[PDB]
Amino acid sequence: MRECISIHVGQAGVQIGNACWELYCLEHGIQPDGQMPSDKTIGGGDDSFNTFFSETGAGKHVPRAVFVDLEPTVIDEVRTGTYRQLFHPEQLITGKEDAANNYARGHYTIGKEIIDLVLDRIRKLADQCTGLQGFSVFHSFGGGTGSGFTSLLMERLSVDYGKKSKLEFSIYPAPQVSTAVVEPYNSILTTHTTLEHSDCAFMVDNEAIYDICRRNLDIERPTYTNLNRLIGQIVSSITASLRFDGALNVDLTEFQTNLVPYPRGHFPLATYAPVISAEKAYHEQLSVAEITNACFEPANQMVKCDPRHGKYMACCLLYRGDVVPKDVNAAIATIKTKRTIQFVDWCPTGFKVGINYEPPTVVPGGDLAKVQRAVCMLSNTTAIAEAWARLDHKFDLMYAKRAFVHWYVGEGMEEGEFSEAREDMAALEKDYEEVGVDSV
Amino acid sequence: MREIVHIQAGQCGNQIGAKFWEVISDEHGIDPTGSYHGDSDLQLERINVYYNEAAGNKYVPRAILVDLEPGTMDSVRSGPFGQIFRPDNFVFGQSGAGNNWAKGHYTEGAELVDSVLDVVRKESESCDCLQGFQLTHSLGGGTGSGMGTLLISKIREEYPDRIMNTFSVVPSPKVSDTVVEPYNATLSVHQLVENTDETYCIDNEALYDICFRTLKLTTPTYGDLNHLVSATMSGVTTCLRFPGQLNADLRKLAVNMVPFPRLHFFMPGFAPLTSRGSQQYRALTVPELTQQMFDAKNMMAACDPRHGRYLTVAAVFRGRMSMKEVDEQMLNVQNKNSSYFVEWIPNNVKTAVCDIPPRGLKMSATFIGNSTAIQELFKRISEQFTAMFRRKAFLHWYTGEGMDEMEFTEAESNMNDLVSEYQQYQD
Ligand SMILES: CC(=O)O[C@@]12CO[C@@H]1C[C@H](O)[C@@]1(C)C(=O)[C@H](O)C3=C(C)[C@@H](OC(=O)[C@H](O)[C@@H](NC(=O)OC(C)(C)C)c4ccccc4)C[C@@](O)([C@@H](OC(=O)c4ccccc4)[C@H]21)C3(C)C
Ligand SMILES: Nc1nc2c(ncn2[C@@H]2O[C@H](COP(=O)(O)OP(=O)(O)OP(=O)(O)O)[C@@H](O)[C@H]2O)c(=O)[nH]1
Ligand SMILES: Nc1nc2c(ncn2[C@@H]2O[C@H](COP(=O)(O)OP(=O)(O)O)[C@@H](O)[C@H]2O)c(=O)[nH]1
CATH class of the missing domain: 3.40.50.1440 (Tubulin/FtsZ, GTPase domain)
Known part of the structure; x- marks a missing residue:
């Protein structure tokens, strides 16, 4: 009452919202669904007086809301030919500072200059209403506005709002990707969240999504415009669900503790087990509790985080729509019945389970099912422990090894931003590993 | 803007x-x-x-x-x-x-x-x-x-x-x-x-x-x-x-x-080269389009990149195709081209997509990159220079324009090491 505050960060982020904000399209909003009759663009809901941003209406009628664009590009979309969605004016930032890929750029450089005005927006935004219990950040692991800008925008937000754990989303590099910059680079963006602040984070592994689309759904041809829905939907579960009236409800402060097992920002995985085809025939309906397993399947797995490795840690599962109590208590048991899940040495009935209603929202053919039973696995497993290694083999050789910084220095600091980000994000690797490598 | x-x-x-x-x-x-x-x-x-x-x-x-x-x-x-x-x-x-x-x-x-x-x-x-x-x-x-x-x-x-x-x-x-x-x-x-x-x-x-x-x-x-x-x-x-x-x-x-800093030079291609008549092959493909983006034969430059390794490869495709499709395909290039990839460097290939295919191709492919190959484009003008202009000298013409031993000797030595420094990667 327990609002979220929704921040975008970059290309990855302005769109991703389009996935978030479209997925909302059911009369909900960040933390205020306290209800609405409007529909559609919301046009038809009325105009009660007003002007830019709406006093007439609550976040409900119009959103939780804050897009940061360091290029008009994606933002022109969301602004684009009143792109079918006018979700408000003046919750967008569009900085024509000319975009910058660099953790250094935008974060140290153009961003500094317009992280403030934004801070101001956030602040005002952080004020109209009550209980904000959440900050959402869409982040990449590559996009200048997403690294330093986010290490900027997460850092200031952590510093300014220590009590409100931030949630941020991620879209991390894997085996394939964009740039050369992103092997390190996101490294840099990884330092910052970290101890700047942050809470639990989530990712969509772009190399996991297009994988799950090829192993679990159908359409190998697919556009990112579609991968956003896989990741878009992750959120709906996280916020729309826990943020809407139901049984066993985890708020954004449930998310922090259930994922967080120790304090070097932790990371999580998202599994959406309902993912049925337009071309499926789920055994008329897909078994509710199998849905749980769907989770563990390495296959729903958003990232290339081979669970193979190690013992999960924190496991937070959010079930929504027509789920049964005896489905959870009794299906969740089962997992902790295989060998494999190998929960950690200090996991104590690790599994956190929430139920939410209504149903699994959906729209359009690109959306798969109308599945009426959902699993969202948010976990902290040792794996993560290896994808950062991956980025760290890249980094020991891409940036530091022989250095790819001459662009980056150009925008700001040398010899840490880099050295510090490797050593601090490094031990992450060692410390992480030691979190789950012996009984001690 | x-x-x-x-x-x-x-x-x-x-x-x-x-x-x-x-x-x-x-x-x-x-x-x-x-x-x-x-x-x-x-x-x-x-x-x-x-x-x-x-x-x-x-x-x-x-x-x-x-x-x-x-x-x-x-x-x-x-x-x-x-x-x-x-x-x-x-x-x-x-x-x-x-x-x-x-x-x-x-x-x-x-x-x-x-x-x-x-x-x-x-x-x-x-x-x-x-x-x-x-x-x-x-x-x-x-x-x-x-x-x-x-x-x-x-x-x-x-x-x-x-x-x-x-x-x-x-x-x-x-x-x-x-x-x-x-x-x-x-x-x-x-x-x-x-x-x-x-x-x-x-x-x-x-x-x-x-x-x-x-x-x-x-x-x-x-x-x-x-x-x-x-x-x-x-x-x-x-x-x-x-x-x-x-x-x-x-x-x-x-x-x-x-x-790095010295002027990184690139080679670039356009695929959708097509043949008027041949017009009929691969409906503006991606692999098509990836395919044509590396070949020795489709580069619109004087290096044949195959001799050596590229260092950076920037490719761009603007056909309205899958953002999953372009990125999934570019990998395959990277694995039958190892030696063409710079061991440093991960992510050896960047991909960008824009939203409108060139007026009348329907679907587009642009390519950028630097490989080790160019040690070529120059180890050719330099062999040229040392033996030419700087050689038994051809600059009387230029010698009036106002450059005296300079702009020659400095241009070979600075542009030279280019050759060595460039090579440096991947020898
Ligand atoms: C370029 C290209 O695709 O040239 C070729 C020649 O070999 C190329 C492969 C193409 O498949 C082919 C053969 C076409 O069949 C295509 O249907 C077509 C397009 C896409 C036009 O190109 C465009 O409309 C584009 O929008 C092109 N526009 C373009 O070339 O505009 C000019 C005004 C330069 C002509 C462009 C490309 C990339 C970015 C932006 C624009 C140019 C064309 O005339 C044609 O070129 C030829 O017949 C031809 C013959 C000799 C010299 C040049 C072209 C074109 C037509 C209308 C036929
Ligand atoms: N899954 C997914 N990945 C996306 C999407 N948009 C961007 N990305 C990923 O984000 C990464 C960076 O995207 P960019 O658009 O280059 O980021 P940016 O905001 O332009 O980067 P900067 O110019 O530095 O600010 C790439 O690896 C993309 O694959 C999207 O909607 N979905
Ligand atoms: N692609 C292209 N090359 C040209 C053109 N005109 C000349 N050239 C080439 O570029 C070289 C230099 O010509 P030009 O550009 O006139 O030289 P400059 O103006 O004296 O430097 C020539 O030897 C040609 O091969 C042109 O219109 N297009």
Whole structure:
């Protein structure tokens, strides 16, 4: 009452919202669904007086809301030919500072200059209403506005709002990707969240999504415009669900503790087990509790985080729509019945389970099912422990090894931003590993 | 708002101007935006107010034009595709055009090289934030070769922040000049080390392979070669500029292809080369499009990249295809090309996609990159230089223009180590 505050960060982020904000399209909003009759663009809901941003209406009628664009590009979309969605004016930032890929750029450089005005927006935004219990950040692991800008925008937000754990989303590099910059680079963006602040984070592994689309759904041809829905939907579960009236409800402060097992920002995985085809025939309906397993399947797995490795840690599962109590208590048991899940040495009935209603929202053919039973696995497993290694083999050789910084220095600091980000994000690797490598 | 600076020099540059730009009332030209959304118009303008800012988008043609010998005046100004514009056009008043780097660069150009400051100023101002400096230019140009390096040098000097984009034309085993060995070598020390951020290649000896292999053309042409390049520029300049789901602004262009400071040079391709008739093969494919983006045969440059490893590969596809599809395909390139990938470097390939396929291809592919191969494009002009100009010397011609042992010796040694330093990667 327990609002979220929704921040975008970059290309990855302005769109991703389009996935978030479209997925909302059911009369909900960040933390205020306290209800609405409007529909559609919301046009038809009325105009009660007003002007830019709406006093007439609550976040409900119009959103939780804050897009940061360091290029008009994606933002022109969301602004684009009143792109079918006018979700408000003046919750967008569009900085024509000319975009910058660099953790250094935008974060140290153009961003500094317009992280403030934004801070101001956030602040005002952080004020109209009550209980904000959440900050959402869409982040990449590559996009200048997403690294330093986010290490900027997460850092200031952590510093300014220590009590409100931030949630941020991620879209991390894997085996394939964009740039050369992103092997390190996101490294840099990884330092910052970290101890700047942050809470639990989530990712969509772009190399996991297009994988799950090829192993679990159908359409190998697919556009990112579609991968956003896989990741878009992750959120709906996280916020729309826990943020809407139901049984066993985890708020954004449930998310922090259930994922967080120790304090070097932790990371999580998202599994959406309902993912049925337009071309499926789920055994008329897909078994509710199998849905749980769907989770563990390495296959729903958003990232290339081979669970193979190690013992999960924190496991937070959010079930929504027509789920049964005896489905959870009794299906969740089962997992902790295989060998494999190998929960950690200090996991104590690790599994956190929430139920939410209504149903699994959906729209359009690109959306798969109308599945009426959902699993969202948010976990902290040792794996993560290896994808950062991956980025760290890249980094020991891409940036530091022989250095790819001459662009980056150009925008700001040398010899840490880099050295510090490797050593601090490094031990992450060692410390992480030691979190789950012996009984001690 | 990432607006844009148009500088066109010499022959290859002014004429090349003719063919880049006309592919634009295709409408996006350089940073307005709009227009191009529901057809219409054409020519050398529209409906508003002039000057300048209607740039390369609605009512105006924005460019900075630099001709040094009234060849670009008459060749396009008049009867041809433009107006241009007035006031935006340089005609050197007979300077007499020069063959020789030192010559419009040190000589007539200085005088004009100053008059090119006024063009740059007015454009710069435009009320938009300029992110490109676009320059056509010619190895062996003197006007272009050594005037383009003058133009480039001040522009890096005054506009450090704004990485220069320069189109290049080169030496291939076939020739113009005889002084082009060394002419483009001096055009070099300045093209590395002269604020030119990234550097395009357009070898005319390689352009033919394309306009004649991929293409059938029965008898190419220098105007038809101007279809080729438009390709290589629109991807860079229009693409990513024009709308887009992962969009790369020009500056992504300078961190993606340079992995270090000395002037990283690239090679670039356009696939959708197609054959008029052959028109019928692979419905604008991606693999199609990936396929054609690496081959030894489809690169629109004078290096055959296969000898060696690329260091950076920037590819861009703007067909409306899967953002999953382009990225999934580019991997396959990377794994049958190891040795073509630089062991440092991960993510050896960047991919960008924009949202409108070139007017009438339906689906597009642009490519960028630096490999180890270029140790070539130069270990050829240098063998040339040491044995040519610097050799038993050919610069009396230039020796009057004002360069004395310098600009030769420095250009070989600085541009040389280029060869060693470049190689350094992956020996
Ligand atoms: C370029 C290209 O695709 O040239 C070729 C020659 O080999 C290339 C492969 C193409 O498949 C082919 C053969 C086409 O069939 C295609 O249907 C087509 C397109 C896409 C046009 O190109 C465009 O409309 C584009 O929008 C093109 N526009 C373009 O070239 O505009 C010019 C004004 C430069 C002509 C462009 C490309 C990339 C970015 C931006 C624009 C140019 C074409 O005339 C044609 O070129 C030829 O027949 C031909 C013959 C000799 C010289 C040049 C072209 C074109 C037509 C209309 C036929
Ligand atoms: N899954 C997914 N990935 C996306 C999407 N948009 C961007 N990305 C990923 O984000 C990464 C960076 O995207 P860019 O658009 O280059 O980021 P940016 O915001 O342009 O980067 P900067 O110019 O530095 O600010 C790439 O690896 C993309 O794959 C999207 O909607 N979905
Ligand atoms: N692609 C292309 N190359 C050209 C054109 N005109 C000349 N060239 C080539 O570029 C070289 C230099 O010519 P030009 O640009 O006139 O030289 P400059 O002006 O004296 O530097 C020649 O040897 C040609 O091979 C043109 O219109 N297009």
